[PDB]
Design an enzyme around this catalytic site. Structure first.
Site, PDB file in Angstrom:
ATOM      1  CG  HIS A 459      -1.686   1.022   1.319  1.00 45.14           C
ATOM      2  ND1 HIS A 459      -2.716   1.395   0.468  1.00 45.14           N
ATOM      3  CD2 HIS A 459      -2.085   2.187   2.310  1.00 45.14           C
ATOM      4  CE1 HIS A 459      -3.444   2.620   0.661  1.00 45.14           C
ATOM      5  NE2 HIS A 459      -3.050   2.898   1.913  1.00 45.14           N
TER       6      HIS A 459
HETATM    7  C1  LIG Z   1       5.040   9.571   6.820  1.00 44.69           C
HETATM    8  C2  LIG Z   1       4.590   7.825   6.828  1.00 44.69           C
HETATM    9  C3  LIG Z   1       4.405   7.033   5.636  1.00 44.69           C
HETATM   10  C4  LIG Z   1       3.993   5.927   5.669  1.00 44.69           C
HETATM   11  N1  LIG Z   1       3.882   5.203   4.545  1.00 44.69           N
HETATM   12  C5  LIG Z   1       3.263   4.049   4.441  1.00 44.69           C
HETATM   13  C6  LIG Z   1       3.054   3.342   3.447  1.00 44.69           C
HETATM   14  O1  LIG Z   1       3.450   3.898   2.235  1.00 44.69           O
HETATM   15  N2  LIG Z   1       2.570   2.119   3.352  1.00 44.69           N
HETATM   16  C7  LIG Z   1       2.385   1.691   4.550  1.00 44.69           C
HETATM   17  O2  LIG Z   1       1.916   0.228   4.511  1.00 44.69           O
HETATM   18  N3  LIG Z   1       2.350   2.121   5.626  1.00 44.69           N
HETATM   19  C8  LIG Z   1       2.926   3.375   5.757  1.00 44.69           C
HETATM   20  N4  LIG Z   1       3.023   4.301   6.749  1.00 44.69           N
HETATM   21  C9  LIG Z   1       2.624   3.321   8.147  1.00 44.69           C
HETATM   22  C10 LIG Z   1       1.305   3.238   8.178  1.00 44.69           C
HETATM   23  O3  LIG Z   1       0.776   4.720   8.310  1.00 44.69           O
HETATM   24  C11 LIG Z   1       0.822   2.909   9.548  1.00 44.69           C
HETATM   25  O4  LIG Z   1       1.537   1.605   9.989  1.00 44.69           O
HETATM   26  C12 LIG Z   1      -0.546   2.727  10.110  1.00 44.69           C
HETATM   27  O5  LIG Z   1      -1.326   3.944   9.577  1.00 44.69           O
HETATM   28  C13 LIG Z   1      -0.813   2.003  11.471  1.00 44.69           C
HETATM   29  O6  LIG Z   1      -2.362   1.969  11.662  1.00 44.69           O
HETATM   30  P1  LIG Z   1      -2.799   1.557  13.112  1.00 44.69           P
HETATM   31  O7  LIG Z   1      -4.410   1.204  12.836  1.00 44.69           O
HETATM   32  O8  LIG Z   1      -2.125   0.972  13.987  1.00 44.69           O
HETATM   33  O9  LIG Z   1      -2.951   3.198  13.651  1.00 44.69           O
HETATM   34  P2  LIG Z   1      -3.260   4.727  12.880  1.00 44.69           P
HETATM   35  O10 LIG Z   1      -3.571   4.723  11.412  1.00 44.69           O
HETATM   36  O11 LIG Z   1      -2.034   5.540  13.061  1.00 44.69           O
HETATM   37  O12 LIG Z   1      -4.423   5.229  13.487  1.00 44.69           O
HETATM   38  C14 LIG Z   1      -4.379   5.522  14.727  1.00 44.69           C
HETATM   39  C15 LIG Z   1      -5.302   6.650  15.429  1.00 44.69           C
HETATM   40  O13 LIG Z   1      -5.562   6.864  16.825  1.00 44.69           O
HETATM   41  C16 LIG Z   1      -5.879   8.022  16.965  1.00 44.69           C
HETATM   42  N5  LIG Z   1      -5.602   8.274  18.182  1.00 44.69           N
HETATM   43  C17 LIG Z   1      -4.430   8.327  19.000  1.00 44.69           C
HETATM   44  N6  LIG Z   1      -4.439   8.369  20.362  1.00 44.69           N
HETATM   45  C18 LIG Z   1      -5.798   8.316  20.621  1.00 44.69           C
HETATM   46  C19 LIG Z   1      -6.629   8.289  21.772  1.00 44.69           C
HETATM   47  N7  LIG Z   1      -5.969   8.209  22.888  1.00 44.69           N
HETATM   48  N8  LIG Z   1      -8.071   8.594  21.559  1.00 44.69           N
HETATM   49  C20 LIG Z   1      -8.443   8.395  20.535  1.00 44.69           C
HETATM   50  N9  LIG Z   1      -7.739   8.592  19.156  1.00 44.69           N
HETATM   51  C21 LIG Z   1      -6.528   8.348  19.296  1.00 44.69           C
HETATM   52  C22 LIG Z   1      -5.238   8.916  15.982  1.00 44.69           C
HETATM   53  O14 LIG Z   1      -5.610  10.157  15.801  1.00 44.69           O
HETATM   54  C23 LIG Z   1      -4.977   7.932  14.749  1.00 44.69           C
HETATM   55  O15 LIG Z   1      -5.937   8.425  13.549  1.00 44.69           O
HETATM   56  C24 LIG Z   1       3.423   5.335   6.809  1.00 44.69           C
HETATM   57  C25 LIG Z   1       3.603   6.224   8.225  1.00 44.69           C
HETATM   58  C26 LIG Z   1       3.943   7.321   8.048  1.00 44.69           C
HETATM   59  C27 LIG Z   1       4.004   8.224   9.357  1.00 44.69           C
END
Ligand SMILES: Cc1cc2nc3c(=O)[nH]c(=O)nc-3n(C[C@H](O)[C@H](O)[C@H](O)COP(=O)(O)OP(=O)(O)OC[C@H]3O[C@@H](n4cnc5c(N)ncnc54)[C@H](O)[C@@H]3O)c2cc1C
Ligand SMILES: Cc1cc2nc3c(=O)[nH]c(=O)nc-3n(C[C@H](O)[C@H](O)[C@H](O)COP(=O)(O)OP(=O)(O)OC[C@H]3O[C@@H](n4cnc5c(N)ncnc54)[C@H](O)[C@@H]3O)c2cc1C
Ligand SMILES: COC(=O)[C@@H]1C[C@@H](O)CN1C(=O)c1ccco1
Ligand SMILES: COC(=O)[C@@H]1C[C@@H](O)CN1C(=O)c1ccco1
Ligand SMILES: [Br-]
Ligand SMILES: [Mg+2]
Ligand SMILES: [Mg+2]
Lengths: 486, 483
Positions: A459
């Site tokens: 992705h």
């Molecule tokens: C610059 C960058 C580029 C990336 N590029 C890629 C890529 O090309 N391909 C790929 O596969 N991955 C990529 N990633 C990684 C990917 O973004 C993450 O692995 C993924 O978003 C993690 O998903 P998740 O569900 O763990 O958390 P997230 O998608 O980070 O969601 C966590 C959410 O929790 C919320 N939150 C936090 N604390 C609280 C709280 N206490 N109460 C309520 N809400 C809260 C935040 O606002 C956030 O929206 C990238 C990351 C970054 C930073």
């Protein structure tokens, strides 16, 4: 003048067989071709059709053509420049293509010099007898003998040649051979044909046309790219139209005359007319069997005209084999190469292997391009009681920003719904030819739809769409299309 | 209010889990996030890090950056235009990016509005008790209560957050979060770190830099992109350098101060100095567990602050689970999504399934990009007696003509030489992230090198190199490299 293997045609299949026989099995190999480098008079040369007047130069020219779209699309991402200063210098493109093809020609010369047993002979190979190939000065069987080659094994690998319809004024028309050497990009061009060559050249000419230019593609039936997925045929049609190409379906040239200014006056079977600068015929390619004098040993040809072969590329004459376009099946370079590699691993390796003609990945370098492997659903639906079709079709985000809203990405998986086995994968959009290659490996491994959907996506990519499809869009049950199963 | 599932974090993994539990299993689901659309002050928002300040906007910006190469490369194919008229308008890129991200934000808003049994709560989620999630006004646990959500099941899905080194003048530096909102493209930028984020932003800033600009990347260790194939680490270093990026390896910032014109004065541990307009720290991402008040329930964290989980995403507290970056394993969106779907199938479907964290296809959107799946040879060589490497590396023909002769395509296949099983595939060059997807499916099907080399190529492609390698380039025998 004595060889284990004599190969007539230093092309995709011929050189693979030639090189392998020499380097892998230390065999004594002769390869014959009519020319040592690209272009007129015989166009194909050392390296074959693909190298000289096929896949290699075409792909460089499609890449060139793609910059018409990149230059425009860049604006959506904030690139600014004087759009009135943009010119497409065709002459540059052809000079850069010629140098790149010549370097490959030289590369193959190098290979033949630097390889014990592997020897190149210049001229026209034909069959004297079961075990003798004669190399003459010309394609006339009466011309002078340059060589008499003794062969324990003979390989026919002479490829194909463009078919030119026998209409009045066909002499005013060109084929792809001449398209590669046009001194100027045509302002108005008619590409004739609905196959990959017509489609790819329409895109090329569309990008390089001078101001007030127009590319017209005509095809004698209703919908271009017969044998490709129907959704993709319709979409390619829309996407070529969106980029300025006129698609004339159910139309076919009846005659061509020269206007007094040297332009071409095309009259269609329908009575319609069209004035163009170039008429490029791409209605078919036919195997090059005439010049081999196959009557001298009685090699059997098919009702179509190709050398008849069994699964091991054997003709009816022991020690005489045929690979690639001369067999008039799937006219692709990697197929020829595969058949060559298998023929040599069989005959000199003592390791019999047959080319698999199923689940062959292929591409059309249309703008945007097609990548495909295995059966289209209409074909699957006649062979399998229950077929499922998984389809995703949308304009990717990048192309909403670029302004090319018409560039819908199409991803279709066709399965045997009884066991989930993937029967075919059909892609339209940027990167499709690259995406499909490892799909070919998946199909060789009998991948099911669950093997795709249980794989984690990369992705963000277009390719991850292939791992996101869990639910059929529709089915065929005993040949009948329906949204839901009974 | 009472729920079957409460999800803290409306991100890649949280939304997969919430949507699947509501729609596939008919559960009543609450999802909490701190912001309804992208950007300051909290940057991540409804949709998660990937949507708002991650994969989605970064890929749009890399696509934008690639036009610098396309415009230059067009000349080799006969394209002519006035080079002196060319400007990279970063404001237009940022505006296009913001609209694309906000449309996604809005579509997620509409998904909650239109999906019954799926409810969104705005604010900061934390654990009051093992079956109660409190939603507060701010990250401060003394801030005002907006909601108390009774939960049979709680999913921790708060993702990760940029790590900032505790150095003097850290306040003069930014992370990727702020980089997405720079109103003007920096003339001089230092990206700190050798990981994908540093390397990807170095390429973005390199394309959009104003005239006379310069991008510098610094990394503490000897060779960027640890964890990637070593040939590719070396080649991507060369190809970044060839496109005008200064790669400073074995260097790390010791402090930053402001020059009198407001530019940043960087002092490296080595006593080297660099003046830049921006310092973007991309040295690491850490799990976002601070704000969750997990001490209220005794959920076990690692010293790093990650939530400890079994293979089924279960914490030490029954009915409390964690997926995605918060677990501090493979920080990828598709992995978070896979873990969320596997958790909901297991817990609500009684369809026991665990995510396979091996043989995950991934990409680096460097210029040019990387696509990889499975083991690098150094790792394989320690796990298997005999390892074969099949390697093809060459400047493709289009790039002789384009004038980018430095752009070597690398294709490498690592095998278990005992049975030919493909352990890893590593690609560098245009198309690599698209090529590697279906390689992911190959490795799930235990493909052998023979399955690759007996597949008929698609020609001409870079991908066909994968199907053209008959003979190993070299071996490892009991951990030792043999030519
Ligand atoms: C610059 C960058 C580029 C990336 N590029 C890629 C890529 O090309 N391909 C790929 O596969 N991955 C990529 N990633 C990684 C990917 O973004 C993450 O692995 C993924 O978003 C993690 O998903 P998740 O569900 O763990 O958390 P997230 O998608 O980070 O969601 C966590 C959410 O929790 C919320 N939150 C936090 N604390 C609280 C709280 N206490 N109460 C309520 N809400 C809260 C935040 O606002 C956030 O929206 C990238 C990351 C970054 C930073
Ligand atoms: C415009 C165009 C585009 C194409 N694009 C693609 C593509 O993108 N991908 C793809 O896979 N395929 C493509 N093809 C098809 C590909 O070129 C052929 O399938 C392939 O070259 C067939 O290989 P072969 O070994 O049968 O013979 P060829 O490669 O055609 O080699 C035959 C050789 O035999 C020589 N010869 C013929 N008669 C004699 C004789 N009597 N004595 C001595 N030498 C002789 C010729 O000079 C020629 O070099 C394209 C074809 C064309 C025309
Ligand atoms: C992409 O290659 C082609 O277009 C081949 C080459 C020649 O055999 C004609 N042809 C097809 O008709 C076809 C349909 C589907 C795939 O190929
Ligand atoms: C494209 O995927 C990546 O870059 C992932 C994301 C994050 O988990 C780090 N990472 C690594 O592979 C890695 C191993 C060691 C250093 O980085
Ligand atoms: Br290192
Ligand atoms: Mg020799
Ligand atoms: Mg709702």
């Amino acid at each position: 003048k004595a060889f284990d293997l004599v190969v007539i045609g230093a092309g995709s299949g011929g050189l693979e067989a030639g090189w392998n026989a020499a380097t892998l099995y230390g065999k004594r190999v002769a390869v014959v071709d009519v020319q040592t480098s690209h272009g007129p008079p015989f166009y194909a040369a050392l390296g074959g059709t693909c190298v000289n007047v096929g896949c290699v130069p075409k792909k460089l020219m499609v890449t060139g053509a793609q910059y018409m779209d990149h230059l425009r699309e860049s604006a959506g991402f904030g690139w600014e420049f004087d759009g009135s200063s943009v010119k497409a210098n065709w002459k540059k493109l052809i000079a850069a293509k010629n140098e790149a093809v010549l370097d490959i020609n030289k590369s193959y010369e190098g290979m033949f010099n630097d390889t014990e047993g592997l020897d190149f002979f210049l001229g026209w190979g034909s069959l004297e007898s079961k075990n003798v190939v004669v190399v003459r000065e010309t394609a006339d069987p009466k011309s002078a003998v340059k060589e008499r080659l003794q062969a324990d094994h003979i390989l026919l690998a002479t490829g194909s040649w463009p078919q030119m319809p026998a209409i009045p004024g066909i002499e005013h028309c060109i084929s792809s051979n001449e398209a590669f050497y046009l001194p100027e990009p045509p302002r108005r061009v008619l590409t004739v044909g609905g196959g990959f060559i017509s489609v790819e050249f329409a895109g090329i000419f569309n990008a390089y046309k001078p101001p007030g230019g127009k590319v017209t593609l005509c095809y004698r039936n209703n919908l271009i790219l017969r044998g490709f997925d129907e959704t993709i045929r319709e979409e390619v049609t829309k996407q070529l139209t969106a980029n300025g190409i006129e698609i004339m379906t159910n139309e076919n040239p009846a005659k061509v005359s020269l206007n007094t200014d040297g332009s071409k006056h095309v009259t269609f079977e329908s009575g319609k007319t069209l004035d163009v600068d170039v008429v490029m015929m791409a209605i078919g390619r036919i195997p090059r069997t005439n010049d081999l004098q196959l009557g001298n040993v009685g090699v059997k040809l098919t009702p179509k005209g190709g050398v008849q072969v069994d699964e091991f590329s054997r003709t009816n004459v022991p020690n005489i084999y045929a690979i690639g376009d001369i067999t008039d099946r799937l006219m692709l370079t990697p197929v020829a190469i595969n058949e060559g590699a298998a023929l040599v691993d069989t005959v000199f390796g003592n390791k019999p292997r047959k080319t698999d003609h199923t689940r062959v990945a292929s591409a059309v370098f249309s703008i945007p391009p097609i990548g495909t492997c295995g059966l289209i659903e209409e074909v699957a639906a006649k062979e399998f009681e229950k077929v499922a079709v998984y389809m995703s079709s949308f304009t990717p985000l990048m192309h909403n920003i670029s302004g090319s809203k018409y560039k819908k990405f199409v991803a279709k998986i066709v399965t045997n719904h009884s066991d989930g086995t993937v029967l075919g994968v059909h892609l339209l959009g940027d990167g499709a030819p690259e995406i499909i290659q490892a799909v070919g490996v998946c199909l060789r491994l009998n991948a099911k739809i669950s093997d795709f959907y249980n794989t984690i996506g990369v992705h963000p990519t277009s390719a991850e769409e292939l791992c996101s499809m869990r639910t059929p869009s529709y089915y065929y049950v005993k040949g009948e299309k329906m949204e839901k199963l009974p």
